[PDB]
Amino acid sequence: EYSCVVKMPSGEFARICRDLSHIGDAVVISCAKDGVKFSASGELGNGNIKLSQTSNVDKEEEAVTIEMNEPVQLTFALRYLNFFTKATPLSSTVTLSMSADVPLVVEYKIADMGHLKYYLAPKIEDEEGS
Amino acid sequence: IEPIQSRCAVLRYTKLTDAQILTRLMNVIEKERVPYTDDGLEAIIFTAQGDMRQALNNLQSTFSGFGFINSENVFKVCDEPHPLLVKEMIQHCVNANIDEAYKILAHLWHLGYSPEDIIGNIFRVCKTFQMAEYLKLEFIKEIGYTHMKIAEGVNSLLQMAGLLARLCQKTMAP
Amino acid sequence: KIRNLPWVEKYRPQTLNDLISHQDILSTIQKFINEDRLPHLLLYGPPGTGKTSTILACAKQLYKDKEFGSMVLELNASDDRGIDIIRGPILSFASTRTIFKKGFKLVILDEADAMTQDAQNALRRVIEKFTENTRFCLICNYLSKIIPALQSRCTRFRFGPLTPELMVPRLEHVVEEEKVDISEDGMKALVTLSSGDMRRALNILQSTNMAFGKVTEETVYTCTGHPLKSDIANILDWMLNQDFTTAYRNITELKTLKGLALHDILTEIHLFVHRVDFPSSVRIHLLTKMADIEYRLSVGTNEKIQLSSLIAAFQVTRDLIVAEA
Amino acid sequence: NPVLRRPPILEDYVHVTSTEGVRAYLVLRASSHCLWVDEFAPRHYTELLSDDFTNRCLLKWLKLWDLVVFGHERPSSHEQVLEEMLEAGLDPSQRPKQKVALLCGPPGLGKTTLAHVIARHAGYSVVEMNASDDRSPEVFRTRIEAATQMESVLGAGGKPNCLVIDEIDGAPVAAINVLLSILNRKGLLMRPIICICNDQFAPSLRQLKQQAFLLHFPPTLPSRLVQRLQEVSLRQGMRADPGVLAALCEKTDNDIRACINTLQFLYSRGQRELSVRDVQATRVGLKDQRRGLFSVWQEVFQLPRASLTSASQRFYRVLHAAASAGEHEKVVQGLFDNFLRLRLRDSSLGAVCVALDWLAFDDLLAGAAHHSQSFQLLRYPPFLPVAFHVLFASSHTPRITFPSSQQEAQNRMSQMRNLIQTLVSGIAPATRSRATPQALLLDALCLLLDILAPKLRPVSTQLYSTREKQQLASLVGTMLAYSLTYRQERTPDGQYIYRLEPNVEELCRFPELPARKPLTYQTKQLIAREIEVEKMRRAEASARVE
Amino acid sequence: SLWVDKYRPCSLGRLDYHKEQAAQLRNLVQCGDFPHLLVYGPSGAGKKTRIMCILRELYGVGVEKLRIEHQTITTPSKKKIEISTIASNYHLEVNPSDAGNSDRVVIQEMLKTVAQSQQLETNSQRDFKVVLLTEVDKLTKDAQHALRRTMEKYMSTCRLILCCNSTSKVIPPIRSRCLAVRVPAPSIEDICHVLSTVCKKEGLNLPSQLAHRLAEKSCRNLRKALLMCEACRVQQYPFTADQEIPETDWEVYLRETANAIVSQQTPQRLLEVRGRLYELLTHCIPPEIIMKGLLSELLHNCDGQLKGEVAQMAAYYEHRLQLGSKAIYHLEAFVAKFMALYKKFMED
Amino acid sequence: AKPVPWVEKYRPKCVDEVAFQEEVVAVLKKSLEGADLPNLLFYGPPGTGKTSTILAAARELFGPELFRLRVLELNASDERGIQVVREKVKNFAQLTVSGSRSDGKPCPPFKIVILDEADSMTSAAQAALRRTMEKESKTTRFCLICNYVSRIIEPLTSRCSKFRFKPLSDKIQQQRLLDIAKKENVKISDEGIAYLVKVSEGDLRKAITFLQSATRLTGGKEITEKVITDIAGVIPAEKIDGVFAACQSGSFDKLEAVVKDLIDEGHAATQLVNQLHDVVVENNLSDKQKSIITEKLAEVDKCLADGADEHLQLISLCATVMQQLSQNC
DNA sequence: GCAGACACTACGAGTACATA
Ligand SMILES: Nc1ncnc2c1ncn2[C@@H]1O[C@H](COP(=O)(O)OP(=O)(O)OP(O)(O)=S)[C@@H](O)[C@H]1O
Ligand SMILES: Nc1ncnc2c1ncn2[C@@H]1O[C@H](COP(=O)(O)OP(=O)(O)OP(O)(O)=S)[C@@H](O)[C@H]1O
Ligand SMILES: Nc1ncnc2c1ncn2[C@@H]1O[C@H](COP(=O)(O)OP(=O)(O)OP(O)(O)=S)[C@@H](O)[C@H]1O
Ligand SMILES: Nc1ncnc2c1ncn2[C@@H]1O[C@H](COP(=O)(O)OP(=O)(O)O)[C@@H](O)[C@H]1O
Ligand SMILES: [Mg+2]
Ligand SMILES: [Mg+2]
Numbered sequence A: 001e002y003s004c005v006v007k008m009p010s011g012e013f014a015r016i017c018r019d020l021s022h023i024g025d026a027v028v029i030s031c032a033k034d035g036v037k038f039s040a041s042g043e044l045g046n047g048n049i050k051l052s053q054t055s056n057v058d059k060e061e062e063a064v065t066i067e068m069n070e071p072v073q074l075t076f077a078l079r080y081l082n083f084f085t086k087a088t089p090l091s092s093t094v095t096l097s098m099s100a101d102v103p104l105v106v107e108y109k110i111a112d113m114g115h116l117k118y119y120l121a122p123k124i125e126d127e128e129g130s
Numbered sequence B: 001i002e003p004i005q006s007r008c009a010v011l012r013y014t015k016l017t018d019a020q021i022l023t024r025l026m027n028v029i030e031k032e033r034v035p036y037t038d039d040g041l042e043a044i045i046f047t048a049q050g051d052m053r054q055a056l057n058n059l060q061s062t063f064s065g066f067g068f069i070n071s072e073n074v075f076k077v078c079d080e081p082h083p084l085l086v087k088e089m090i091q092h093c094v095n096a097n098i099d100e101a102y103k104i105l106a107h108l109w110h111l112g113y114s115p116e117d118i119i120g121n122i123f124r125v126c127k128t129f130q131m132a133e134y135l136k137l138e139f140i141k142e143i144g145y146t147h148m149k150i151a152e153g154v155n156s157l158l159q160m161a162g163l164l165a166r167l168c169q170k171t172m173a174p
Numbered sequence C: 001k002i003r004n005l006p007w008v009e010k011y012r013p014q015t016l017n018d019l020i021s022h023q024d025i026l027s028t029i030q031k032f033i034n035e036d037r038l039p040h041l042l043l044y045g046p047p048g049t050g051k052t053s054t055i056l057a058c059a060k061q062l063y064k065d066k067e068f069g070s071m072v073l074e075l076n077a078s079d080d081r082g083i084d085i086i087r088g089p090i091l092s093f094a095s096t097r098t099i100f101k102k103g104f105k106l107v108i109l110d111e112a113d114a115m116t117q118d119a120q121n122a123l124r125r126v127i128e129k130f131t132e133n134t135r136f137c138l139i140c141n142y143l144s145k146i147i148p149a150l151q152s153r154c155t156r157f158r159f160g161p162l163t164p165e166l167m168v169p170r171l172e173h174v175v176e177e178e179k180v181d182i183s184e185d186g187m188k189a190l191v192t193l194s195s196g197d198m199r200r201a202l203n204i205l206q207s208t209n210m211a212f213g214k215v216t217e218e219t220v221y222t223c224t225g226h227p228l229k230s231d232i233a234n235i236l237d238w239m240l241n242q243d244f245t246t247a248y249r250n251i252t253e254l255k256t257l258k259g260l261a262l263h264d265i266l267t268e269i270h271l272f273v274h275r276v277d278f279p280s281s282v283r284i285h286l287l288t289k290m291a292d293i294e295y296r297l298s299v300g301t302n303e304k305i306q307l308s309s310l311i312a313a314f315q316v317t318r319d320l321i322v323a324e325a
Numbered sequence D: 001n002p003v004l005r006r007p008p009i010l011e012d013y014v015h016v017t018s019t020e021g022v023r024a025y026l027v028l029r030a031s032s033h034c035l036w037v038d039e040f041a042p043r044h045y046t047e048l049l050s051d052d053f054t055n056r057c058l059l060k061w062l063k064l065w066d067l068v069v070f071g072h073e074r075p076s077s078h079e080q081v082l083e084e085m086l087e088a089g090l091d092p093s094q095r096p097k098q099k100v101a102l103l104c105g106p107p108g109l110g111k112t113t114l115a116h117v118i119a120r121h122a123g124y125s126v127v128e129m130n131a132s133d134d135r136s137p138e139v140f141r142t143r144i145e146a147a148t149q150m151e152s153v154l155g156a157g158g159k160p161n162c163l164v165i166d167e168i169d170g171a172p173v174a175a176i177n178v179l180l181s182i183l184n185r186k187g188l189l190m191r192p193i194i195c196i197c198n199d200q201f202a203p204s205l206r207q208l209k210q211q212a213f214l215l216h217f218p219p220t221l222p223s224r225l226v227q228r229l230q231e232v233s234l235r236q237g238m239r240a241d242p243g244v245l246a247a248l249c250e251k252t253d254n255d256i257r258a259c260i261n262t263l264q265f266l267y268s269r270g271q272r273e274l275s276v277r278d279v280q281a282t283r284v285g286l287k288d289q290r291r292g293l294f295s296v297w298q299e300v301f302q303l304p305r306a307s308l309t310s311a312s313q314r315f316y317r318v319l320h321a322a323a324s325a326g327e328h329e330k331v332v333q334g335l336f337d338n339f340l341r342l343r344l345r346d347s348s349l350g351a352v353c354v355a356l357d358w359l360a361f362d363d364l365l366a367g368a369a370h371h372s373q374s375f376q377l378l379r380y381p382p383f384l385p386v387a388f389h390v391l392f393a394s395s396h397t398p399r400i401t402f403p404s405s406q407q408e409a410q411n412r413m414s415q416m417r418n419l420i421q422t423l424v425s426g427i428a429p430a431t432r433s434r435a436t437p438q439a440l441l442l443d444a445l446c447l448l449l450d451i452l453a454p455k456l457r458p459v460s461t462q463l464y465s466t467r468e469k470q471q472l473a474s475l476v477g478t479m480l481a482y483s484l485t486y487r488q489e490r491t492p493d494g495q496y497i498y499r500l501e502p503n504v505e506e507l508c509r510f511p512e513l514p515a516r517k518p519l520t521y522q523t524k525q526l527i528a529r530e531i532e533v534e535k536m537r538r539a540e541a542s543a544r545v546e
Numbered sequence E: 001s002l003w004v005d006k007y008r009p010c011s012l013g014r015l016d017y018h019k020e021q022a023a024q025l026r027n028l029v030q031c032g033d034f035p036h037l038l039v040y041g042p043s044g045a046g047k048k049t050r051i052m053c054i055l056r057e058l059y060g061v062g063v064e065k066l067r068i069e070h071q072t073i074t075t076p077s078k079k080k081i082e083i084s085t086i087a088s089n090y091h092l093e094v095n096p097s098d099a100g101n102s103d104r105v106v107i108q109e110m111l112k113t114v115a116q117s118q119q120l121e122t123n124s125q126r127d128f129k130v131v132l133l134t135e136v137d138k139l140t141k142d143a144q145h146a147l148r149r150t151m152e153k154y155m156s157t158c159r160l161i162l163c164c165n166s167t168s169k170v171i172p173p174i175r176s177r178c179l180a181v182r183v184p185a186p187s188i189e190d191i192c193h194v195l196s197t198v199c200k201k202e203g204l205n206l207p208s209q210l211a212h213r214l215a216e217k218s219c220r221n222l223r224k225a226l227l228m229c230e231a232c233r234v235q236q237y238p239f240t241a242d243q244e245i246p247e248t249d250w251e252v253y254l255r256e257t258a259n260a261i262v263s264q265q266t267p268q269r270l271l272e273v274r275g276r277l278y279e280l281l282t283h284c285i286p287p288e289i290i291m292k293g294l295l296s297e298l299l300h301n302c303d304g305q306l307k308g309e310v311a312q313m314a315a316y317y318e319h320r321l322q323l324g325s326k327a328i329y330h331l332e333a334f335v336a337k338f339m340a341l342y343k344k345f346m347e348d
Numbered sequence F: 001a002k003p004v005p006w007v008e009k010y011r012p013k014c015v016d017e018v019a020f021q022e023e024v025v026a027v028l029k030k031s032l033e034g035a036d037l038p039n040l041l042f043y044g045p046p047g048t049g050k051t052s053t054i055l056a057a058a059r060e061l062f063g064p065e066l067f068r069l070r071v072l073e074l075n076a077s078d079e080r081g082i083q084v085v086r087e088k089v090k091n092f093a094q095l096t097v098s099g100s101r102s103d104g105k106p107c108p109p110f111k112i113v114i115l116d117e118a119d120s121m122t123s124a125a126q127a128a129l130r131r132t133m134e135k136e137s138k139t140t141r142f143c144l145i146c147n148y149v150s151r152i153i154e155p156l157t158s159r160c161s162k163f164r165f166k167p168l169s170d171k172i173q174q175q176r177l178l179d180i181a182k183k184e185n186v187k188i189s190d191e192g193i194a195y196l197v198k199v200s201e202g203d204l205r206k207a208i209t210f211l212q213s214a215t216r217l218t219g220g221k222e223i224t225e226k227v228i229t230d231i232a233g234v235i236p237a238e239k240i241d242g243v244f245a246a247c248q249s250g251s252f253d254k255l256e257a258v259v260k261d262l263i264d265e266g267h268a269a270t271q272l273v274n275q276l277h278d279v280v281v282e283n284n285l286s287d288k289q290k291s292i293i294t295e296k297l298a299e300v301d302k303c304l305a306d307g308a309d310e311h312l313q314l315i316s317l318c319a320t321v322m323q324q325l326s327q328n329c
Numbered sequence G: 001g002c003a004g005a006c007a008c009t010a011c012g013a014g015t016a017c018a019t020a
């Protein structure tokens, strides 16, 4: 059972992963009850974007929703997320699943034939002891 | 390249003699009203080393800093050339005299010369020194072996003294 | 106001009167500035002697604070100084007039030995063509890495090593401006361990004052880790007076007791090997062996074996010196 | 004496004690409008200054095109191959079999002059394409195709176009490929092409040297050059003896243009008579020549025949020749490959040992300069050839060969590494991790081939014993484990053979090693058939399991 | 499958020799906080077998299911270099020396990406991953200087098992960071026992004298001993006590090369010997092994008062060969110096 | 709850946990109070605590939240070319010093650039650091860490304050090892800890690794001298006596036999050089023989440091000591 | 108003050399 399951548009997620490519080589995904936050801290500066409460749209594929409770903050590589977003137009939506130690799961429900899952392990956290 | 030198007349200029530098310097002195002595102009000619730019620069520096041209006013701002003492230390290394060679090496070390400049002048003197050819090749090989250590990071007075000791050992070992 | 700076940058000679040693060169440069006859300069010498400080004091004396950014172009080894920079920003700076006030401009090229030979060959006609408009100052540590064409165009000043007689009053000024309790042997140890360098004398002074709170001979030689003169005399006496085992035990106990390093021992023994009236055949062998031992310590090599070889180089020549008589 | 038995009275002292415990003490304390080369340039065939054999060969080669260019049947050692190629006949396309003439030699001989004079003499119009053009392959193609594949715009009576390509050795390799493609279009080439270079041994011209009429220029004769300079001085009203003209000729290394420019500078109008000391001075007329590799090796390995007898002058001359030659690594390889072929007088091999020490010094300097990025160590390897001149200088006539051993060994080592990687990539990854390729090469190759080659009679497996069938099963199991197989190979002698598809025998076997019995053709064909039926049986067994 | 791979032990309890070290290695890796390991010993001792037994002891039996993974790495000179890697679902096996002088680019880029990332499944896999750096003695010092902070920063999630032959080629910063595990070569009795057990599992009979001669000729190399025993089984099924054992061609070629050296001392013979040494360097034989074989064959022909000088010359030119880049210069210099010494000894 | 090796579990989190390096620890503790921290150059043998001291100092100065904004740590595991120094290091040094500690502790007004393993940097990349260190000294600090100070250029030597990390003495190393063994509920005898601090030779990382591996091998019972000799790779004295007897024999066949037996047992040549050196300096040989033999030992150690073959260097050393031992016979 | 053609600079790629 994942500590955070969210739903996003596919092309919007591809644009989100592409916008953080020019900033840093490793991105930070945070998922609280508010929504999903993308960060990219580098030598230039932090690029932080958020998506929350986009259920008031005519299209059913733009509903950015939260489905779990426990907030997570995990650092992932950029190239693997770009290769994950290379398979966008198969499905209208995409599902992101995260937890404290479980890897990031990127799920596409490809039409009626079947589904595709991506598992990305997080990065090793820095020595941030007090 | 050879086609361009074939397509032109290749004029070659040699180093200016002391009289040729002295004539132009006396023209500049009479144009500028620079008071001088003969030992001062001799020191300027000695520090120029066939360069008219260095002669004019040293003359202008001495005249601006002191206002008179004698030997000590020139040498308070200018410097004696490096190979003029490097030739003497190489000559001392040829006769296996390590004490005078180390005296010249320590005099060059206390003047602030880096080991790279010192070993470059040592190679420059040993390239055109007047000695035996096989001894010259052994000297050049020992200089290159020391310069590899100088370039790799270890560069102290002990390394240059060891180079001088090896050059003096090459004489006594046929 | 109080600032958190290293003492080599907090205490910098902002004027030409605050530098200590090269009085003839600084007097000549001051008379160049006062008569507006400043040529292209070539400052060379060992590190820490005050060349960058000299040219920065000259640039602050020549130009005011309201025009310093348009008259001075300072480029160093941290900047890109390729041939496209000589053909680009440097040539455009040299060939154009000023913005605010009429005057001659200055292009400071710190660490000029780090420039490529293409850039140095491109700089020649930039220096010679715009002599009236701009002036160039090349500063280097190694004069051999500057081409002779640039050495001809710039008059050269040898900023030689700072003599310890003239290094003392500047250190006294730094001490009295920092409230440091220092003895005479502490100042003597500072000017001995500096060896013609005022960076290393300020660094060692600040490090000793932070580590111990007082600056004496023992505190300086403990913070630096350098062996004392008596330790080197004892090591030489043990290597020349007794057999291999007792000398090895005594030098090993002395090194373990005081935490000495073999590089500094080799340097001080090399300095002692010329004061001692050795035979010329003995001195050649000792210098060759000590140079070899110094070369072997530059890699991943056990220092105890090298200490044994340092003892061995003198135990070889003991009977030779004695039987020479 | 530096050592005193008595201690000093006033000076400080330091003790020295030996192993026997006796103390010692030491002290511690338009005639004026043009150049003379352009004024005296040859405009006819009769006033040329080149070699007459080269002039006749170039003229005959250009006259061989009269049957296909002008449409007329009648026009009006190294020498033997040129004379054979001049009389070798024509292709059925009415052309000479060498459609490109290549002119090579040292600068200042008259190669461009000979090409222009021979083109204007045979009724052609010279089309020049030199190194000041763009020389990109598209521009090169659109210039050669314009000059060679079109007729004259003047209609009848217009001169044909003879394309003279100056400085072809500076052209890139793709431009030479464009030239060879337009030379070998079968788009047929109808016009002659003349190429002029200064170095025939350039890497971009070798494929041209297999196809071109290679004309090599010898240096000009000193007598003809002295006579021509005498005629030039008499035309210009200046007096000079033939001795000082021979001194200029030997100073400029038979360079016509350099000698004429030197005379033009040295005469002026102040004086009429040239002096010996003006030519003998180094201030006017001396130029740096690029020495060939063989000339440098001849200077190193052979003494000059008998002032110039001092060893220091020979030292500096060999040093300056090796410095001015260039291509330092080729000189090092030639010295390494030619110094053991001499009749060495050093029977104790001390000179060979110190020469190899100098070679190792060169190698260490190259490694240190390429490691520490300190290239100011690259002043000492120029003293590697001159050191050989002190070691192996002889009055004999050595036969210097071009170095090939360090390149052949490098190519063979690269092919051996490719073969090793090809062998390694075929093994299963379960057994690849158990041994490194180095240990597999050193330990598990010759013994592996001895395992793979048992004593097998040339008989059917049906007549084989159960033990022979088990041995064959083990043999095909260890053959299929390492992905090794036998396939048929063709020979020019007409016999089919069976060979391993990874040919590991050249990895294992050595030339001078005693001969061993190979397997017969029937046994290897049996092994190949058994490995094929074993692969298909393994596929069927894997299908039956899954 | 050969006898070197068919009867390799799978666990630490199935090792025929060094059983006390097997028990100590089982006790060392049981807790999971064991440091980096540096397995060193002579070639053929059983280092890789013990490393794979350590991996079995750590993870499941899934470490025997291996696969080839290809990686492309970009050099600072922008030259794409392909490197193979033995991999499993629990560990990786990298040989960076296949990148040669670019091996540092393997350490700085390929290895750290392994170290900086945690694992996918933490239940079937353990809490850490293992990287096997094979033949770290052939690494350059730049790569070994790139190794140390990667070994120190991420050692709680990536353990490393370096394997080498001599620890003198490993820099002291790397040797300080890892526990050194010495695997000595098996003795003659251990190799005889291993060969007897292999022949008994194959259903054969092996004499003690033949096994002793195989262990003597293999020079305490168990891989070469097993290959020689299988080759002797192939070439003659009845195991005679005085059966002729097959030999490697480069070893007998080295013996013939040293016989050609000692036969005549002339520059023409030196040029022939230089041709033989190129033939040896052509077939990818390392030059230190050529020097060792030349010394081991030339010492059989020298007198008692020359062997020390010949061995000192061999070591001196081996060190100068390691300092340089062209092996043929130092090899021919050693041969020429030996020829001069041999001519001086024989004429006097 | 994952286990962690003891070299990282007992890394000094603060500057008070660093052992025996009293001068640099006192300098950093003065800089913790608010004194002017100069540029640092740490150099010494491996395992003496150069990286741990500066990481503990950075953690004490900036705390957990300011480590990513005030510390730039570059080592030899990443690319440090001329462009990395010219672009990345200079742009980090030109940044503002913003961000304050949330726990109320004081924060110094500078950044720290830790250029660990500065031996591997080229001379051009080290020359590009000079005016970056001098010009940006108001807002950042530099700490070059190396093992050999000769490989760092003299301008960077002059610009930094040099601190040499001595090898740890037996008192401090034994006290720290006994504290670690007390905190891990393992018992080690006095002979075991004496042989451990003899073997480790001032390398505290090697001592902690040996202590952890001896704890894991014995399972938590008493650690004797025998397990330390087993895990330390120490050659027994019987082999050294056999080597010296083979050298005193004067026959090269026995010398080749004992050299091949030591090579086939997998003993490191550095350990053999150390033990032979101790035997040579602790016997009754003459001073000339000891002198020549120790010079050959130093040359052999230098050759092994350059990656030469162990067998040839050991047979050359054995031939030299055999010649010296048979000279007086 | 939008498709086709023109030159424009930024960028990727290959090569050489580095000394007195
Ligand atoms: N003559 C001097 N008088 C006073 N302080 C000096 C002097 N020379 C050096 N210093 C001190 O050293 C600091 C740096 O000196 P620099 O100007 O860098 O010397 P430098 O000789 O130009 O050094 P290099 O060669 O560029 S490393 C100054 O800010 C002072 O703290
Ligand atoms: N017979 C002659 N009398 C006088 N001058 C001549 C004679 N033949 C040639 N020259 C001149 O000598 C030079 C000959 O060189 P060119 O033929 O133009 O070029 P090249 O001989 O191929 O040498 P390179 O390699 O192009 S520098 C030209 O300056 C001619 O004018
Ligand atoms: N002085 C010390 N005080 C306490 N623990 C230490 C000390 N020195 C080393 N250690 C321990 O040993 C480990 C290694 O210390 P490091 O700081 O990495 O050594 P080092 O100076 O970096 O060696 P190099 O030169 O980088 S190989 C640390 O993590 C500590 O556990
Ligand atoms: N305990 C053992 N019992 C039987 N055979 C062994 C044992 N240990 C090793 N071997 C065999 O000896 C050979 C040693 O090779 P390897 O394990 O790769 O060690 P190394 O890496 O030192 O060569 C292997 O082929 C293996 O099959
Ligand atoms: Mg400066
Ligand atoms: Mg021409």
Ligand SMILES: [Mg+2]
Pocket: F050, F051, F116, F145
């Ligand atoms: Mg460290």
